[PDB]
Amino acid sequence: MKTPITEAIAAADTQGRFLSNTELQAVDGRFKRAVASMEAARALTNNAQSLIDGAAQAVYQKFPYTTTMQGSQYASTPEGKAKCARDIGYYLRMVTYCLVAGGTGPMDEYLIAGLSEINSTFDLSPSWYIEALKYIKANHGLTGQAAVEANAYIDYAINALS
Amino acid sequence: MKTPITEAIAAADTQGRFLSNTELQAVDGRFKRAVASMEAARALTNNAQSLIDGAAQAVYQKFPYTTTMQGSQYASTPEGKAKCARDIGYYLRMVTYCLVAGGTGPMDEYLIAGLSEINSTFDLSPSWYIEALKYIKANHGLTGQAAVEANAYIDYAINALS
Amino acid sequence: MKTPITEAIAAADTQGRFLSNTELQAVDGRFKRAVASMEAARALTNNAQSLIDGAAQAVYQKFPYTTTMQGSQYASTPEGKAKCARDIGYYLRMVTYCLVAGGTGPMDEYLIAGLSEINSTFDLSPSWYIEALKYIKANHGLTGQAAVEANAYIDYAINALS
Amino acid sequence: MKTPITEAIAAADTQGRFLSNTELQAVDGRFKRAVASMEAARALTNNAQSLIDGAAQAVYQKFPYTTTMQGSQYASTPEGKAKCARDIGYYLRMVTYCLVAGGTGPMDEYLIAGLSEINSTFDLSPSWYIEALKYIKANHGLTGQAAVEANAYIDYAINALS
Amino acid sequence: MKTPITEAIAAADTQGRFLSNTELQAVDGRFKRAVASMEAARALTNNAQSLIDGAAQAVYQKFPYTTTMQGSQYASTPEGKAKCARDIGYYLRMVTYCLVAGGTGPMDEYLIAGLSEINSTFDLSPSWYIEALKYIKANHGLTGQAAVEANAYIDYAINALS
Amino acid sequence: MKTPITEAIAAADTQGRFLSNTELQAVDGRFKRAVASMEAARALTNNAQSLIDGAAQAVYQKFPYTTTMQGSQYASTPEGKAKCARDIGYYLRMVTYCLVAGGTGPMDEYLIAGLSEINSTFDLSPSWYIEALKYIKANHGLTGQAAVEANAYIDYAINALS
Amino acid sequence: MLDAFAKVVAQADARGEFLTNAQFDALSNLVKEGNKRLDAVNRITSNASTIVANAARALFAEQPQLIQPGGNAYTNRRMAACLRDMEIILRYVTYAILAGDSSVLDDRCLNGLRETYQALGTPGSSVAVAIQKMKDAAIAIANDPNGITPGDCSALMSEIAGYFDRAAAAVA
Amino acid sequence: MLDAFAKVVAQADARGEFLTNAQFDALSNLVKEGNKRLDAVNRITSNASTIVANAARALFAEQPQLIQPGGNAYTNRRMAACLRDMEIILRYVTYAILAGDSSVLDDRCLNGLRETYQALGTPGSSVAVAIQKMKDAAIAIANDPNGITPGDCSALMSEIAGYFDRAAAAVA
Amino acid sequence: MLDAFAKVVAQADARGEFLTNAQFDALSNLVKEGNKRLDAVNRITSNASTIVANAARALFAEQPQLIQPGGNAYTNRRMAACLRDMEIILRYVTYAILAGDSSVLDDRCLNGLRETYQALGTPGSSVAVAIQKMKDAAIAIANDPNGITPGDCSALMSEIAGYFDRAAAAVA
Amino acid sequence: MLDAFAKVVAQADARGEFLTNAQFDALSNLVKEGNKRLDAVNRITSNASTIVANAARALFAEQPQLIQPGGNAYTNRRMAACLRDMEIILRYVTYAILAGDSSVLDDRCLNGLRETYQALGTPGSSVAVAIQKMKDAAIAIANDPNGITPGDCSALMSEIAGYFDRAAAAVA
Amino acid sequence: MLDAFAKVVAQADARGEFLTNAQFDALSNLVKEGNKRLDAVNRITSNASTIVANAARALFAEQPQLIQPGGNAYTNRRMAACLRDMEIILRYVTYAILAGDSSVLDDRCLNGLRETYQALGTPGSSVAVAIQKMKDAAIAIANDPNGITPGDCSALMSEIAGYFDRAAAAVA
Amino acid sequence: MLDAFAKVVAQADARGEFLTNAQFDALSNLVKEGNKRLDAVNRITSNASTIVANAARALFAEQPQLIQPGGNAYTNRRMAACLRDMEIILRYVTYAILAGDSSVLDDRCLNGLRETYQALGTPGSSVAVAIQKMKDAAIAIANDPNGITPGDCSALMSEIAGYFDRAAAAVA
Numbered sequence A, B, C, D, E, F: 001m002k003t004p005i006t007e008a009i010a011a012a013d014t015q016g017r018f019l020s021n022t023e024l025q026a027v028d029g030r031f032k033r034a035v036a037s038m039e040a041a042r043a044l045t046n047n048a049q050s051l052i053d054g055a056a057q058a059v060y061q062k063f064p065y066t067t068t069m070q071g072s073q074y075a076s077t078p079e080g081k082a083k084c085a086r087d088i089g090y091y092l093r094m095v096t097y098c099l100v101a102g103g104t105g106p107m108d109e110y111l112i113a114g115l116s117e118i119n120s121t122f123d124l125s126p127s128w129y130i131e132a133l134k135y136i137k138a139n140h141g142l143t144g145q146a147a148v149e150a151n152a153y154i155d156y157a158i159n160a161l162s
Numbered sequence G, H, I, J, K, L: 001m002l003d004a005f006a007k008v009v010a011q012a013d014a015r016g017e018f019l020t021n022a023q024f025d026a027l028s029n030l031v032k033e034g035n036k037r038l039d040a041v042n043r044i045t046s047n048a049s050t051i052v053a054n055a056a057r058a059l060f061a062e063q064p065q066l067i068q069p070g071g072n073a074y075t076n077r078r079m080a081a082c083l084r085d086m087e088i089i090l091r092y093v094t095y096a097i098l099a100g101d102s103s104v105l106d107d108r109c110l111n112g113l114r115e116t117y118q119a120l121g122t123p124g125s126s127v128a129v130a131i132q133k134m135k136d137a138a139i140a141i142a143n144d145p146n147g148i149t150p151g152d153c154s155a156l157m158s159e160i161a162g163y164f165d166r167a168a169a170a171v172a
């Protein structure tokens, strides 16, 4: 999994070298940033449910057809709505994994790999999940560098869907 | 050249990716460490001459034969002594390059690549340069994290010679 | 370009061989089928405009939001509608290229290569173009083996979008 | 084995694709040609013995030395003659395999691969087998497209020996 | 060209090494053998014409059909006979090149490479040239180690034709 | 192991060929040289002890510091002296292996591979072993071609250390 | 790779025999059924994506633990891998339908596939369910009496079923 | 690689146009001449070895310096290389006859071939003679009125000649 | 690859000199501006997709012949290639912003790129327009005064502009 | 490869769960001990060569049959291979110290290493001795109270010992 | 690869010993027999093709089921493969004769060859017959008293037989 | 690669001629001088390292700007590269001495080497000085009258000089 620390080791291991100051400086930056990253992960976790519930509605309001249109890919049934809230929660949970791990690795491995294939096969529009992420970014209530961490990984998701 | 920043870019460029928070945390650690690294580079530069002069003698005292033994590889002639002081200064100057660049790149590219070949061809014993570096490490007069930076790159040289 | 004839040559050329009866039988099947393929290409070309106009509406009726929703990717403006009718015509024209060439080559090279990238970047939903192709398949008015040829390449487009 | 159908599949399988109309047109040409191919295979099989007996003599008349010259590679002994008639029958049987399979695969795999090595090691002259095949081509009594199929694979053998 | 000396260099050059005693011993064996090799080359050159004339007849006697049978590949015409005597002389001249060079290189490069292709295309039977070489081997009149050298390269030709 | 004979076979085996006169001439040169090579190997073996004892002193006289200087890499202790005499004997024994085998293989495989790594890790100066070999070369008492063989492999060791 | 024709050829060659009349007649009836064979391949292939998608949608409805956290088909990487395996199996099955012989499916798809799923933790019994779904869908589509010249394709649909069953039996 | 059909397609696409009737009729007449095209390919291909051999035998008779010591076709290595080049050229020409378009011959055979012979010392003017020999032989064989349904193949033989001339012009 | 720091090192080494105070002070001020540099990289990178898309949408509006049949950006293959080139250029520009030096952009992106577009028929003058669009968008985004600690980043925005201009000048 | 943080992430994901407070607090205390972890890695790494050399010198003193003729570490090729294996093991151990997790050491060093030594004739019991020597030396060096801010690193030294023991147990 | 000389060297080294007189005398007698060894290699090699061909001709006479339809040596592909295996075995045997040691034959020819024939269906017992034929022919040729300096080569012919038997024993 | 013998062979073949007596006598005198040729190769090769080192030591004494900061031979990477080039040139020269022909040196060392040094900034005029130094040293060593059977090697030393001059002329 791609974290600042596994990148440091990967770099050294690729060249057949012991670690050096070059790499330890990189891990120190991960350890220092961790303060702001944890603060964000803890806040997003504590407010996860209202953020998922809020994000799901932002989608249904932006894209009303997804609640009235017939089809197993839409949220026009109780099951559809459940699947959607489920997916939004998956995205939110991956953001907190990235904050805790200090990199994109968790989202890369668990969500982004295969994403475009899944969205095509099941006829899921990326516009939906972008809007859900855009809503979380606006209403997570984070300030300072904690917001910068959170937005960096939410915007990372958004670029994967664009 | 191998610095914390070119490693960050190399990592991203290798995978065909934009930079991510994973990499920016690494550069932040380089920028934070720079305070201690610069302090050391400035001090080693300001006291370079007495350190070179002191280190050269530590060698001649440890290895007296290098001043009395006949041969173009020894410091038994004015030219030999000049070449030796020159080489010690090269090592000291590379340490300060590594501190300024934030990594081993300068020493790797300008000194370590080819080192063993050069020491074999011209019959230069690594024991000599280790002793010179050991002397600099003991008498650079650095405290705190500045000493840790300096010693990390001097000990890096020593491992290349061992 | 991938046609029954270039596949025959490619096969022989790959192995360093002259053509053989194995390959000539394949071209004969292309020449025999051409009767039905041409009939379809000529009919789809002769009725192209009403099919494009009909297909565009099937989309706007199936997906009404694409005509009322704000955004440069939707057909909520005269330009948007023009772009859409343009795209539907591109799909129809590729079907006739495939019928004339006797294979998928034209559509593969001019439309399918890059398709998923284009639909993601400009936020164009594949569901739209599938519905347009589904409408053309139902209302091209072709019978017998001419219909089988036409449907084979329209359904080929649909699988590329699924 | 190389048949029109395994070439179609090979082509698709090489590119990681389902079959397409491009390939099915090729198999249709194999299925249509099969009428003429079978007619030839059935006739060559029904008259195989007189064709083998006739072909063997055409050789001994064209190359009389092969019946009078001493050596295990010649037909100057009852065993030699048996081996020769055997070989001519092998060639005739491969022609009928190619007609039934619709391609060169049978002859390629069972006879042509290794042919030049075998003819060198055992001192068998290709001129002999060409003359035997030339005789079969002239006296198989086939007309129309059945003759075209038969001659295509007999001439295919001849080119392998030239 | 493959000689004992170019093999020695090739070996060293392949491994990135200076020559060593391992290789010089090999060249010494070439220089010592040269006495016997030259003696043979000089004798075969001095008696080349009677050997070519004798060898050509051994062929026509062994294979009488090659003088009476119609075809541009046979010696049934003045031109055919000229081509044959020419070819036999080519073989004899290559044997002397191998003796002078101390290896197979000359024959490998000028005659053996392409041999089987040429004999197939122009319908030239290897049995002919084997008989010509067999005659030269029996009537070159060489004794001792000179004969051993000559026979080693004539038998080398024969194996290339078998 | 690299001997004149395994090089001959290696050459043939690399190209997929039987041996040829090209290679047998090389082995003959090994068999002829063996006279002088054996004479040297037998003499160096018979006088090994006085040569080792003499060579060890040449080193301690040339490099007196190796007997007075503290450190496990020096001969300033009974164990150190034992290790040194041991190493000199290893070099002498490899020279006799090379003479018996007719090539560098024994020394290449048992001593040279890894040499520079070992001399660096244990802080053993190549100058020492060169002087020991230089002494053996001057006092082995060999004349004629036996001396040429011995010196070829001693100078081969010296180049590996330079 | 062998098709129905090369299959007979390779058996006659092993015996050193010309073909008999029983074989020339059997191979003629393949040809006479070739149109039907091409309709089936064309139909299954033109609906490849819906066959796969609908099969997966049903599989995950019936076995929702495959998509729960920890499930073998959880995360998009493993879901995509699963949908791919279903695409691949269907692709090699359509190859076999065109060839009249299972060798392509055996040699290039099914051989070693049981060992692959065992080494990965993938339940082949669930992959078999998936293959069963595709089968019923492919046969329903290929034997649809609509928009085609009426006739009897029952023997062909038995053959097509045979390949699906073969693949399903090789993973379980 | 383009055949006659893909050629028209790629021109219409560059213009963004459906095909006109003048194009649908022209492409139909190719199809109606397809049998003749297959007879020519089959005939030239079934006599590939005699076309090449007899062409070489004549070339070397007319230009015996190519086979004298020092000649570019002296030694069996260079003779084989020469016979091969003749095989290769003929092979790509028969490809073009089947495709109705020279692109395969141009892209995969003739492009850069003049520069190759110049860098090797091979006289392309003699290679052109060789290609001329094969041409006359291939046309004589392909247009043989014997053992075939009578008809007019003159336009096809002009096309076939066009490819041989094209190759001959590209090496000289 | 060189960053701003390695750049100075490599110049001092060429002279055989320790660093002077003018250099130790200059390299300290880079560090003191490092936060701003990371905000710019983060901001441009977090909006990579909208920077590219909106830039293309404007390019094709202004130059609609690039998307007409025959145009260099017509068909999805060439459109995707164009969008990719824009992604790639932007990616190497953000690399340069982090390094404080253009060497990565020069060595790995811009060197030889003019010759590439010339050999393909791509109008580099239109690629320059594209790069100009991204520039204005990236600077507007990176220098947005909102949601960040107030301060002066003008020197940094001049540097960022320098890289975009450099790339735009190398293709035209 | 997993570090201490990714380890927790991958366990929560398998359960489909957000992290609990017990996990957010545990991962915060890793960070708060990060300085100590970097001192240990730096110290062991800065003395890599003396750790290895002195360990070998002791190993061969205690087991002189490894360097006698016929011994597994006799000749410079096998001695160098032995010193290398010791370098490699130490390198992957320092990787694990930085990551807070043994996965890199397991996956890339220790897995299959027992089988390698068995197939070569190398006594893993002697390799374990070597690893034991390096361990005591590395801990003595890394926990040296001199020239560092005083504090308690005992838990870290237990962890570091754990990795050495793990490697030693995997070869024996 | 080891020759007779390197063999002794590698045994002395394993013991850490100089060579004794018993070894210097034994290695001198190899040299003194070197001419005979070169005559044998030269003779077998100069008749490689007749040794192989005549051996096969006899094998197939005695075991005609190997060449009947279905036989392992039926078809030209398998016949050529068989003749090749016979060429290869003979080639590695002549290598061993020159080296005075079987290691080249063992390591590069015979090792794993029994498993190869078992996995292919080739009867190694018939391959052994083939190797037996070549043996008698090679010895008859190599020990021919004609056209050579008279002398005793009996020990050499026993050695040569040893290699053939070794190969024959390794496939059966 | 050609040696002195293959050289004559390739000239006779181009003419289609047997060798004349003038050629059989010339090639016999090479053989009769073979011992001297082997002494020269052995002597130069046994002193390769001192030839190179002493040559470099003198080169850098005479041209100290090559080792000053900025010099082409400054840093250990470029010094090692320089010493290597000197090793390589000397190695290919000794090859030529053994072969009696410069082709190996030309084809595998000197061809394109002038262009290489020009593209790198290396002054070939200084490389020529280096080659001149090695030449004088190699000839002094190879023609040393000590410890060898007395005789005249002057023609050989002229040849050896010819190769050094050839290499020196090809870089300048």
Ligand SMILES: *[C@@H](C)[C@H]1/C(=C/c2[nH]c(/C=C3N=C(/C=C4\NC(=O)C(CC)=C4C)C(C)=C\3CCC(=O)O)c(CCC(=O)O)c2C)NC(=O)[C@@H]1C
Binding pocket: A033, A144, A145, A148, B021, B024, B025, B028, I032, I033, I034, I035, I036, I037, I038, I039, I040, I042, I142, I143, I144, I145, I146, I148, I149, I150, I151, I152, I153
């Ligand atoms: C110019 C681009 C605009 C601007 C930038 C700005 N930022 C600061 C302060 C900070 N910026 C960061 C950002 C990061 N540090 C990291 O390690 C990473 C990657 C993980 C990032 C993205 C931080 C941590 C700070 C310090 C904390 C803070 O919020 O201040 C300043 C003030 C100067 C300074 O360096 O501190 C400025 C000016 N502000 C503007 O008005 C410009 C439009």
